Design a protein around this nucleic acid. Structure first.
Lengths: 24, 53, 87, 154, 164, 97, 132, 89, 61
RNA sequence: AUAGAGUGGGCUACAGGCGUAUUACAUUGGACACCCACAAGUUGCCAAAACUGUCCGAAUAUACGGAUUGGAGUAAAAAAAAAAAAUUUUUUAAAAUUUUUUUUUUUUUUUGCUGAAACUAGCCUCCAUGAAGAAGGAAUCGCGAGUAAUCGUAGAUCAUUAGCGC
């Protein structure tokens, strides 16, 4: 997971460090 | 922990208060009613209510 | 899913109110409720109480009868209706 | 003044076009432009002992803040041997760090060329000439090859 | 005291080019002093013909119908843009402009138009009294352009207010 | 194939207009009613047509009956997009670069 | 005089060696130069590197069949720094300390005409002399 | 800096150390045993020793397989519900 | 704290992520967008020369 | 009935074997901060690797790695107005405030998400358990400059689901 769950890096891999913009 | 400066969001509507520093101008826009003139009525009332401050 | 409305069991509830003609849960604690209850959908959640109820759940080929006991109270009923891929 | 076409198209697998000239302005301050990537840059050169060297507003040592990249900035300036006496005013856009360095290096080279003709290359005499700095005038306009419309396929 | 901006959208550069030239002919005709005898012309140095680049986006396709995952091909849409700039002081020729663009039909080419202009504002006398300087020109109207039988000669027209 | 059956589903999203469903969704997304959301959501998604929620639409193509590989770019499907593209009977979409 | 920069830069680029910053390998190789200073005066650095690489120059190359081929000396430098570095990874993976220490101790030993680089080096020298 | 406890995970480890006062950059060779008594007391203030938890989850999924439930026969079968090499049994 | 005056001046509130049901009103409606998606002629044009049956006529032979 | 609907499965099952990818097996590294470094990308603003600082190197399976499995869906920060005002905390001599304690206020985030319904079988967040794996034989594939590799990034279809696919 390249540190998927708990990092400041693997969470750009899981698309969460970029906080999802509010859209619909 | 990162967000874009230009949120440019959606799923809502408003009067969009904004200022332009380049030309020293405030900007308010229309969004609520279908016709343009009804919006001109709403923002004209908002301008009058703006001057109550 | 507890937020903003946690429980969905409407058709099951219509059948439960059909059972609830003398007691929903042996108010007349439980005595097995011999009248069979046969649902047609397993997306339903399980609500607290509902004990001693003979539930017949659909598997896509039949109806599966399973008696509910105290442990399966916080579950969704489709967890008890498999496709039988045993081997 | 009589400037001319200086440009080149040196690269392989993708061309380039830096149509911008280098020229001296009537303030005694020459201006020049350079890109070596699609990221691009411009310069403005004052013979001065003022603020010294400047890209992007800030002093250079914090903006660029790998040392090897800093001598990639200074390499035409160090090759010239005319380091100190000019205020270096410059602007950049785009890309990645040492691409910005070698781009701003090329632009600084061009401005130094119109300051001193013989050190570097120009279009003053038919787009030809030779000095120590004439090699790094014409930009290395290779960009990335395009990610291949096709497969890994392996 | 009226300002006009015309934006123009196209697919073939031929049609947007003819559109830009013909509306330029219309503007220069619309404020033309055809005779000397009345002499408040606006060729003030606001006036431009700014060209523009586009929105680079490539949209690719499978060539083959079934298996064929080797078979790719790239496809692509172009939008070519110009903006046309002028401004003027009397309204009757502005109406000649709007009726001029009402008549001459243009092929495949969108007309989006910006009409910031001065228009006077009534106030309730309380806020005029409690006034007793910056720009504050803030109306910015908005209109739809589709789903009701229009192939987009839409006119948007923000407004500028004045109440000293 | 069956493009029209989906149009019937779309028409049911609009005959039993989604506003009625979404307004009941408003009161179930409100936490202000302490309860009865379970009663409101108990029915009102069952008396309301189950085939009128906005997930049962699958967005098929319009030229043909394609149900997979559609494009909202120009409301067509890939093989037709290519056929119209080579024909050029489409709004200026040429082979790229 | 510029061949010092040439050999050092080829050392840097061959020290890059996996995809990464040549800043990372550049600070790594400069750390090897300073660690060479520390171990050398512990128990005079560009000096020992230039001596080590000029000790390590394979002048005539051989091609298998066995046929000798004359070699332009820039590829002699280029093979040279290569053989140094695969011997370096041999020693460092055997030590599995950093790589900077390993390249430092190898530049000292190839300066001292000793080590597996020198062994490979002069056997292919003599084998170039063999098959003429 | 007890990134070092074993019967627990890391975040609760630094939590228990913080709950008796151990900061970062301290080693296990630098804690006096009074703080060991304190952290053990805080372990029965916290939950204890993940093999006690492994016994606990043994009766937890014992409860789940006692329910005649197909995740129970997953746990008697070893199938991923999201490496049958490890199981909770 | 000045934006409170701008807020009560303009009547605004935090639009996303609060769970008060207002997002389901202020959302745009997709109802026009869902039914303008298709385009089916009825297979018999009321004007004239319907092609959808001319193809049947051609393949009848 | 090889025709249409309706409800629920199944199209994703799981001795084996094979193909394609990703992630690692560390120190050229992990972590954490930094300025939140500069992009493709202002036309009708936004990253990561790294650079700089700091912690870590015991066969520890390491603070590497992150597969499986249980469990739970929780914190606040900002500041305004009035009354009073010169109080809290140690040892056997000291310390923090000149703001302590009451009322009214008040924002901005927070809410598990999206969907009618997330057990199978989505996804998110946070705990806990921490597997193999210490670089891979025979065999073999791909590619010689802004290329491999490594690093993000954004577009599609899409209610949400692409982490690895394209």
């Amino acid at each position: 997971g390249k540190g998927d769950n708990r990092t400041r890096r693997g969470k750009i891999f899981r698309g969460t460090y970029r906080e999802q913009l509010p859209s619909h | 922990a990162a967000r874009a400066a230009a949120n440019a969001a959606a799923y809502p509507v408003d009067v969009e208060h904004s200022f332009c520093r380049r030309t020293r101008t405030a900007a308010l826009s229309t969004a609520r009613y279908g016709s343009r003139e009804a919006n001109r009525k709403l923002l004209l009332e908002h301008y009058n209510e703006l001057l109550r401050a | 899913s507890t937020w903003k409305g946690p429980y969905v069991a409407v058709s099951l509830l219509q059948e439960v109110v059909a059972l609830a003609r003398k007691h929903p849960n042996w108010w007349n604690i439980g005595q097995k409720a011999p009248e069979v209850i046969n649902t047609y959908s397993r997306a339903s959640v399980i609500l607290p109480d509902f004990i001693a109820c003979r539930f017949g759940v659909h598997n896509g080929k039949s109806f599966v009868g399973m008696e509910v006991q105290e442990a399966m109270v916080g579950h969704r009923l489709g967890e008890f209706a498999p496709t039988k891929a045993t081997v | 003044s009589g400037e001319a076409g200086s440009g080149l198209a040196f690269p392989a697998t993708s061309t380039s076009p830096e149509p911008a000239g280098p020229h001296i302005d009537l303030t005694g301050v020459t201006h020049a432009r350079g890109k070596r990537k699609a990221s691009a840059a411009s310069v403005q050169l004052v013979p001065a002992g003022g603020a010294g060297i400047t890209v992007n507003g800030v002093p250079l040592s914090s903006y660029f803040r790998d040392p090897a990249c800093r001598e990639k900035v200074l390499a035409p300036l160090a090759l010239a041997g005319a380091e100190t006496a000019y205020d270096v005013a410059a602007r950049v856009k785009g890309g990645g760090m040492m691409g910005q360095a070698q781009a701003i290096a090329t632009a600084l080279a061009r401005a130094l060329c119109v300051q001193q003709p013989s050190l570097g290359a120009t279009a003053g005499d038919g787009g030809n000439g030779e000095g120590p700095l004439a090699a790094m005038t014409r930009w290395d306009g290779r960009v990335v090859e395009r990610q291949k419309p096709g497969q890994a396929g392996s | 005291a009226y300002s006009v901006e015309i934006a123009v959208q196209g697919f073939e550069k031929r049609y947007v080019d003819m559109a830009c030239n013909t509306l330029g002919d219309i503007i220069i005709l619309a404020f033309a002093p055809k005779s000397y005898a009345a002499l408040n012309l606006a060729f003030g140095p606001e006036r431009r013909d700014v060209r523009l680049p586009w929105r680079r986006t490539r949209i690719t396709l499978i060539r083959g119908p079934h298996i064929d995952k080797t078979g790719m091909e790239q496809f692509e849409r172009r939008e070519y843009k110009s903006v046309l700039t002028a401004a003027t002081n009397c309204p009757q020729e502005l109406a000649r402009l709007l009726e001029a663009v009402k008549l001459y039909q243009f092929t495949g080419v969108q007309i989006k138009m910006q009409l910031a202009s001065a228009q006077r504002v009534d106030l309730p006398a309380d806020v005029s009294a409690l006034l007793r300087x910056x720009x504050x020109x803030x109306x910015x109207x908005x209109x739809x352009x589709x789903x009701x039988x229009x192939x987009x000669x839409x006119x948007x027209x923000x407004x500028x207010x004045x109440x000293x | 194939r069956g493009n029209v059956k989906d149009h019937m589903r779309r028409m049911l999203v609009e005959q039993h207009e989604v506003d009625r469903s979404v307004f009941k969704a408003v009161t179930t997304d409100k936490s202000v009613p302490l309860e009865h959301r379970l009663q409101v959501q108990r029915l009102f998604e069952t008396e309301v047509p189950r085939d009128s929620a906005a997930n049962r639409v699958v967005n098929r193509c319009v030229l043909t009956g394609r149900a997979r590989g559609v494009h909202r770019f120009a409301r067509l499907s890939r093989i037709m997009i290519r056929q119209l593209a080579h024909s050029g009977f489409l709004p200026g979409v040429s082979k790229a670069s | 005089x510029x061949x010092x920069x040439x050999x050092x830069x080829x050392x840097x680029x061959x020290x890059x060696x996996x995809x990464x910053x040549x800043x990372x390998x550049x600070x790594x190789x400069x750390x090897x130069x300073x660690x060479x200073x520390x171990x050398x005066x512990x128990x005079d650095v560009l000096e020992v590197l230039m001596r080590a690489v000029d000790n390590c120059k394979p002048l005539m190359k051989v091609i298998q069949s066995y046929q000798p081929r004359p070699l332009n000396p820039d590829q002699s430098t280029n093979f040279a720094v290569k053989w140094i570095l695969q011997a370096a990874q041999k020693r460092r993976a055997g030590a599995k300390a950093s790589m900077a220490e390993a390249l430092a101790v190898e530049l000292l030993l190839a300066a001292q005409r000793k080590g597996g680089a020198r062994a490979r080096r002069d056997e292919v020298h003599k084998l170039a002399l063999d098959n003429r | 800096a007890l990134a070092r406890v074993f019967g627990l995970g890391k975040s609760t480890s630094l939590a228990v150390s913080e709950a008796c006062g151990i900061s970062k950059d301290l080693k296990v060779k630098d804690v006096k045993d009074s703080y060991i008594q304190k952290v053990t007391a805080y372990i029965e203030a916290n939950f204890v020793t993940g093999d006690t938890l492994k016994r606990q989850v043994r009766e937890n999924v014992l409860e789940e397989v006692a329910i005649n439930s197909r995740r129970g026969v997953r746990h008697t079968l070893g199938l991923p519900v999201s490496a049958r090499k490890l199981r909770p049994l | 704290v000045m934006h409170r005056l701008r807020n009560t001046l303009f009547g605004r509130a935090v639009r996303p992520r609060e769970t008060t049901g207002r997002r389901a009103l202020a959302r745009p409606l997709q109802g026009k967008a869902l039914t303008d998606w298709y385009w089916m002629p009825p297979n018999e044009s009321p004007g004239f020369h319907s092609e959808e049956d001319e193809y049947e006529l051609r393949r009848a032979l």
